[PDB]
Enzyme design. Structure first.
Site, PDB file in Angstrom:
ATOM      1  N   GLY A  44       9.574  -0.242  10.037  1.00  0.00           N
ATOM      2  CA  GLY A  44      10.294  -1.430  10.459  1.00  0.00           C
ATOM      3  C   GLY A  44       9.744  -2.763   9.993  1.00  0.00           C
ATOM      4  O   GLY A  44      10.326  -3.800  10.336  1.00  0.00           O
TER       5      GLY A  44
ATOM      6  N   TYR B 249       0.440   5.318   1.611  1.00  0.00           N
ATOM      7  CA  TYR B 249       1.024   4.229   2.392  1.00  0.00           C
ATOM      8  C   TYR B 249       2.532   4.363   2.540  1.00  0.00           C
ATOM      9  O   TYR B 249       3.120   3.619   3.330  1.00  0.00           O
ATOM     10  CB  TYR B 249       0.691   2.843   1.793  1.00  0.00           C
ATOM     11  N   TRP B 250       3.156   5.282   1.810  1.00  0.00           N
ATOM     12  CA  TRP B 250       4.580   5.565   1.798  1.00  0.00           C
ATOM     13  C   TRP B 250       5.344   4.538   0.966  1.00  0.00           C
ATOM     14  O   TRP B 250       6.591   4.596   0.900  1.00  0.00           O
ATOM     15  CB  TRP B 250       5.182   5.608   3.209  1.00  0.00           C
ATOM     16  N   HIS B 251       4.651   3.614   0.307  1.00  0.00           N
ATOM     17  CA  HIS B 251       5.292   2.546  -0.452  1.00  0.00           C
ATOM     18  C   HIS B 251       5.283   2.846  -1.939  1.00  0.00           C
ATOM     19  O   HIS B 251       5.011   1.962  -2.762  1.00  0.00           O
ATOM     20  CB  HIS B 251       4.606   1.217  -0.164  1.00  0.00           C
TER      21      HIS B 251
ATOM     22  N   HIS C 164       4.900  -4.809   2.210  1.00  0.00           N
ATOM     23  CA  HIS C 164       5.925  -4.013   2.879  1.00  0.00           C
ATOM     24  C   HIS C 164       7.215  -4.310   2.139  1.00  0.00           C
ATOM     25  O   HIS C 164       7.838  -5.363   2.355  1.00  0.00           O
ATOM     26  CB  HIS C 164       6.027  -4.354   4.363  1.00  0.00           C
TER      27      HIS C 164
HETATM   28  C1  LIG Z   1       7.447   6.728   6.539  1.00  0.00           C
HETATM   29  C2  LIG Z   1       7.709   5.452   5.781  1.00  0.00           C
HETATM   30  C3  LIG Z   1       7.550   4.232   6.429  1.00  0.00           C
HETATM   31  C4  LIG Z   1       7.778   3.033   5.760  1.00  0.00           C
HETATM   32  N1  LIG Z   1       7.635   1.841   6.463  1.00  0.00           N
HETATM   33  C5  LIG Z   1       7.904   0.720   5.830  1.00  0.00           C
HETATM   34  C6  LIG Z   1       7.788  -0.519   6.566  1.00  0.00           C
HETATM   35  O1  LIG Z   1       7.475  -0.621   7.749  1.00  0.00           O
HETATM   36  N2  LIG Z   1       8.082  -1.651   5.817  1.00  0.00           N
HETATM   37  C7  LIG Z   1       8.423  -1.676   4.474  1.00  0.00           C
HETATM   38  O2  LIG Z   1       8.650  -2.765   3.938  1.00  0.00           O
HETATM   39  N3  LIG Z   1       8.523  -0.502   3.786  1.00  0.00           N
HETATM   40  C8  LIG Z   1       8.282   0.637   4.447  1.00  0.00           C
HETATM   41  N4  LIG Z   1       8.405   1.830   3.767  1.00  0.00           N
HETATM   42  C9  LIG Z   1       8.751   1.790   2.341  1.00  0.00           C
HETATM   43  C10 LIG Z   1      10.180   1.368   2.077  1.00  0.00           C
HETATM   44  O3  LIG Z   1      10.960   1.706   3.221  1.00  0.00           O
HETATM   45  C11 LIG Z   1      10.667   2.101   0.831  1.00  0.00           C
HETATM   46  O4  LIG Z   1       9.778   1.830  -0.248  1.00  0.00           O
HETATM   47  C12 LIG Z   1      12.075   1.704   0.423  1.00  0.00           C
HETATM   48  O5  LIG Z   1      12.909   1.866   1.568  1.00  0.00           O
HETATM   49  C13 LIG Z   1      12.572   2.583  -0.700  1.00  0.00           C
HETATM   50  O6  LIG Z   1      13.927   2.208  -1.020  1.00  0.00           O
HETATM   51  P1  LIG Z   1      14.734   2.967  -2.135  1.00  0.00           P
HETATM   52  O7  LIG Z   1      16.145   2.374  -2.148  1.00  0.00           O
HETATM   53  O8  LIG Z   1      13.960   2.953  -3.412  1.00  0.00           O
HETATM   54  O9  LIG Z   1      14.807   4.468  -1.601  1.00  0.00           O
HETATM   55  P2  LIG Z   1      15.591   5.118  -0.389  1.00  0.00           P
HETATM   56  O10 LIG Z   1      15.814   4.117   0.678  1.00  0.00           O
HETATM   57  O11 LIG Z   1      14.834   6.365  -0.007  1.00  0.00           O
HETATM   58  O12 LIG Z   1      17.043   5.463  -0.952  1.00  0.00           O
HETATM   59  C14 LIG Z   1      17.277   6.574  -1.841  1.00  0.00           C
HETATM   60  C15 LIG Z   1      18.466   7.319  -1.286  1.00  0.00           C
HETATM   61  O13 LIG Z   1      18.973   8.208  -2.305  1.00  0.00           O
HETATM   62  C16 LIG Z   1      19.337   9.427  -1.694  1.00  0.00           C
HETATM   63  N5  LIG Z   1      19.357  10.432  -2.750  1.00  0.00           N
HETATM   64  C17 LIG Z   1      18.293  10.851  -3.506  1.00  0.00           C
HETATM   65  N6  LIG Z   1      18.613  11.688  -4.466  1.00  0.00           N
HETATM   66  C18 LIG Z   1      19.994  11.791  -4.359  1.00  0.00           C
HETATM   67  C19 LIG Z   1      20.952  12.520  -5.089  1.00  0.00           C
HETATM   68  N7  LIG Z   1      20.654  13.316  -6.123  1.00  0.00           N
HETATM   69  N8  LIG Z   1      22.247  12.401  -4.714  1.00  0.00           N
HETATM   70  C20 LIG Z   1      22.550  11.612  -3.685  1.00  0.00           C
HETATM   71  N9  LIG Z   1      21.736  10.870  -2.929  1.00  0.00           N
HETATM   72  C21 LIG Z   1      20.466  11.005  -3.319  1.00  0.00           C
HETATM   73  C22 LIG Z   1      18.301   9.627  -0.599  1.00  0.00           C
HETATM   74  O14 LIG Z   1      18.765  10.549   0.380  1.00  0.00           O
HETATM   75  C23 LIG Z   1      18.158   8.191  -0.065  1.00  0.00           C
HETATM   76  O15 LIG Z   1      19.047   7.897   1.010  1.00  0.00           O
HETATM   77  C24 LIG Z   1       8.179   3.061   4.417  1.00  0.00           C
HETATM   78  C25 LIG Z   1       8.322   4.277   3.756  1.00  0.00           C
HETATM   79  C26 LIG Z   1       8.105   5.475   4.432  1.00  0.00           C
HETATM   80  C27 LIG Z   1       8.248   6.783   3.687  1.00  0.00           C
END
Ligand SMILES: Cc1cc2nc3c(=O)[nH]c(=O)nc-3n(C[C@H](O)[C@H](O)[C@H](O)COP(=O)(O)OP(=O)(O)OC[C@H]3O[C@@H](n4cnc5c(N)ncnc54)[C@H](O)[C@@H]3O)c2cc1C
Ligand SMILES: *[C@@H]1O[C@H](CO)[C@@H](O[C@@H]2O[C@H](CO)[C@@H](O)[C@H](O)[C@H]2NC(C)=O)[C@H](O)[C@H]1NC(C)=O
Ligand SMILES: *[C@@H]1O[C@H](CO)[C@@H](O)[C@H](O)[C@H]1NC(C)=O
Ligand SMILES: *[C@@H]1O[C@H](CO)[C@@H](O)[C@H](O)[C@H]1NC(C)=O
Ligand SMILES: *[C@@H]1O[C@H](CO)[C@@H](O)[C@H](O)[C@H]1NC(C)=O
Ligand SMILES: *[C@@H]1O[C@H](CO)[C@@H](O)[C@H](O)[C@H]1NC(C)=O
Ligand SMILES: *[C@@H]1O[C@H](CO)[C@@H](O)[C@H](O)[C@H]1NC(C)=O
Ligand SMILES: *[C@@H]1O[C@H](CO)[C@@H](O)[C@H](O)[C@H]1NC(C)=O
Length: 518
Positions: free
Chosen positions: A118, A457-459, A497
């Site tokens: 969050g 860190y999950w990032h 974050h």
């Molecule tokens: C446990 C955890 C806690 C975190 N806490 C924080 C925090 O407090 N603050 C912060 O700033 N960041 C935090 N982060 C990091 C941040 O949330 C992420 O880096 C960011 O949300 C990633 O965004 P994204 O759009 O790259 O990926 P995502 O938001 O993961 O979006 C990718 C989407 O694509 C979908 N997908 C994948 N492959 C396919 C496919 N072949 N077909 C269809 N759909 C598909 C997935 O299901 C997913 O919904 C956290 C991460 C984790 C793991």
């Protein structure tokens, strides 16, 4: 304060957008669109909503809707989703890097904003010039405000976060920045996507800003392949539904396919589709559509290092809101109830001691990082089989040096008057704390601690970098009508974050697409 007039208030999670969400089993979703967005996540949702202001958009997400997993919708449920076993349908998909570090990614409409901790921050203002992209900085800021109006609040006081903030300041993480959304050196209260009722707000709610006449969302849509012309252009996608049947959708005219499938999903889908390193893909007998040596290369995971203290009196659980920022380390602490089932990847392996009383998880993040690894395919055909991912933690000695600095600063934090009441023994040293797991230790002992006890860190980020796979408009080089917008696009963090940056980026690139088209 004018700059915070626009923040969201306490409110129920807004699922109004479900009116245009459909099961991917519905074949009437097949057909031609102006835009197809792959991945309904942090960047993908605001991107799709933005494009739908003018054009017909299909958003494809492999996971289901968050209402199916109610513990994703509250701050109190954060640990639950990580504790839950991965049955292939849950919002948390577990994985283990080749380094041996447990990790998770999201599998749900809303992406990782539905499962994350969050914390909300805007990018370090130096990031934009560092990239060399010609950002429209006024538009960047308007776009942050568009996100923040929907899902970001100023957090209320929490006793443990205030303790930690007083400690950071006493330990020298200066200045005191008060409440601020900006990633700047010093100690601050930042924004949160949990509201002050504990309700989680997330990227899926930005779908409510889309035009309901133009936006369609297919859930449990597993996108297996990008389709190309036979001037190379992307023309559409193949996706399968939850029953296993296949479906095809196409873009038309001057429209585009955008991959927003995350650090892991975007390189995987590009590789499966024949976009990637020529020798590698040829060795798998995947026909190369576009050779590019960098697809799935330069994949990064910022290290998390930590200690856990067990105060002799209970502390209240808290979500992270107070950040201690230096250029060489970013620090926070969460307080938690005990548990007998571990939240997967909170600690780096499943054999980690369990807390039987309340505890403070006190954390430091390595910036960058400079160490990098790769995403490669496990299966040459099945997108539901997770790729191999290796991060090579601490392969670059600068990362190790920065962890040592951060760990020394955590030692300073444990020595503050702020933290003294949480010692079990009123002795002079920090061995007066009771520790869950390994306590803090010259640099050789700190280096060993950093290497042995690292977690994710999950990032994580990278794998489809601007400047390697993409141009400055996020277009896949060599391919018309194909872009990538998500955390695969940058080799360093925007801040401690990054969800705020990638939420903004989805809408920002959508606006760039619309403007280029006009
Ligand atoms: C446990 C955890 C806690 C975190 N806490 C924080 C925090 O407090 N603050 C912060 O700033 N960041 C935090 N982060 C990091 C941040 O949330 C992420 O880096 C960011 O949300 C990633 O965004 P994204 O759009 O790259 O990926 P995502 O938001 O993961 O979006 C990718 C989407 O694509 C979908 N997908 C994948 N492959 C396919 C496919 N072949 N077909 C269809 N759909 C598909 C997935 O299901 C997913 O919904 C956290 C991460 C984790 C793991
Ligand atoms: C904000 O981001 C910038 C990166 O663009 C960081 O500044 C660079 O890194 C160190 C800072 O100690 C210097 O060696 C570089 O010269 C800096 N570059 C510039 C242009 O200033 C900075 O550390 C980040 N700030 C925080 C608080 O994380
Ligand atoms: C939050 O409440 C304030 C009260 O001043 C109001 O002005 C604002 O419109 C509300 N924000 C949102 C996003 O609804
Ligand atoms: C889609 O429909 C199938 C039945 O054909 C069902 O098993 C599945 O749960 C549905 N998924 C969603 C997200 O509604
Ligand atoms: C954008 O907002 C930041 C605060 O987040 C501010 O420091 C900066 O000056 C703003 N830039 C522009 C171009 O308005
Ligand atoms: C690729 O196909 C060739 C036959 O054309 C075969 O000799 C080779 O073993 C195959 N490699 C893989 C990894 O399938
Ligand atoms: C697939 O991943 C597993 C780990 O889950 C690994 O043991 C196995 O070797 C991988 N297979 C291939 C072909 O990469
Ligand atoms: C560490 O990373 C920096 C920056 O990318 C690079 O210049 C340096 O060569 C790296 N060190 C090693 C040992 O790879």
């Amino acid at each position: 304060h004018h700059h915070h007039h626009h923040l969201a208030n306490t409110s129920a999670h807004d699922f109004s957008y479900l009116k245009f969400v459909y099961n991917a089993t519905d074949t009437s979703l097949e057909g031609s669109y102006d835009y197809i967005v792959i991945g309904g996540g942090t960047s993908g949702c605001p991107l799709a909503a933005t494009l739908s202001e003018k054009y017909k958009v299909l958003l494809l997400e492999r996971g289901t809707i968050a209402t199916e997993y109610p513990n994703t919708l509250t701050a109190d449920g954060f640990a639950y989703n990580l504790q839950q076993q991965d049955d292939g349908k849950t919002p948390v998909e577990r994985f283990v890097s080749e380094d041996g570090i447990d990790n998770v990614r999201a599998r749900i409409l809303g992406g990782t904003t539905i499962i994350n901790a969050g914390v909300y921050a805007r990018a370090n203002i130096s990031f934009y010039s560092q990239t060399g992209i010609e950002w429209d900085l006024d538009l960047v800021n308007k776009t942050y405000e568009w996100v923040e109006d929907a899902i970001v609040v100023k957090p209320n006081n929490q006793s443990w976060q205030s303790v930690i903030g007083e400690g950071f300041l006493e330990a020298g993480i200066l200045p005191d920045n008060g409440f601020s959304l900006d990633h700047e050196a010093g100690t601050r209260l930042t924004g949160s996507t949990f509201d002050n009722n504990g309700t989680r707000h997330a990227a899926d709610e930005l779908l409510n800003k889309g035009d309901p006449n133009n936006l369609l969302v297919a859930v449990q849509a597993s996108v297996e392949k990008i389709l190309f012309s036979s001037n190379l252009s992307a023309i559409g996608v193949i996706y399968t539904d939850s029953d296993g049947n296949s479906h095809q959708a196409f873009v038309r005219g001057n429209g585009e396919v955008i991959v927003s499938a995350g650090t892991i999903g975007t390189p995987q889908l590009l590789l499966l589709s024949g976009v990637g390193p020529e020798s590698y893909l040829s060795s798998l007998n995947i026909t190369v559509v576009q050779p590019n040596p960098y697809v799935g290369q330069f994949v990064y995971d910022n290290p998390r290092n930590f200690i856990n203290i067990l105060p002799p009196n209970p502390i209240e659980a808290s979500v992270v809101t107070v950040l201690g920022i230096r250029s060489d380390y970013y620090q926070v602490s969460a307080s938690s109830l005990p548990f007998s089932t571990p939240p997967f990847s909170l600690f780096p392996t499943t054999s980690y001691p369990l807390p039987n009383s309340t505890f403070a998880h006190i954390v430091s993040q390595v910036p960058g990082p400079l160490s990098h690894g790769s995403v490669t395919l496990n299966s040459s055909s099945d997108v539901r089989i997770a790729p191999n991912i290796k991060f090579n933690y601490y392969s670059n000695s600068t990362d190790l040096a920065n962890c040592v600095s951060g760990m020394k600063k955590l030692g300073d934090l444990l020595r503050t008057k702020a933290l003294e009441p949480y010692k079990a023994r009123d002795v002079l040293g920090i061995d007066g704390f009771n520790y869950l797991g390994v306590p803090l230790p010259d640099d050789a002992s700190f280096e060993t601690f950093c290497l042995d006890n690292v977690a994710s860190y999950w990032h994580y980020h990278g794998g489809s970098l601007v400047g390697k796979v993409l141009d400055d408009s996020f277009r896949v080089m060599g391919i018309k009508a194909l872009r990538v917008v998500d955390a695969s696009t940058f080799p360093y963090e925007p801040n401690s974050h990054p969800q705020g940056f990638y939420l903004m980026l989805g809408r920002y690139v959508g606006l760039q697409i619309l403007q280029e088209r006009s």
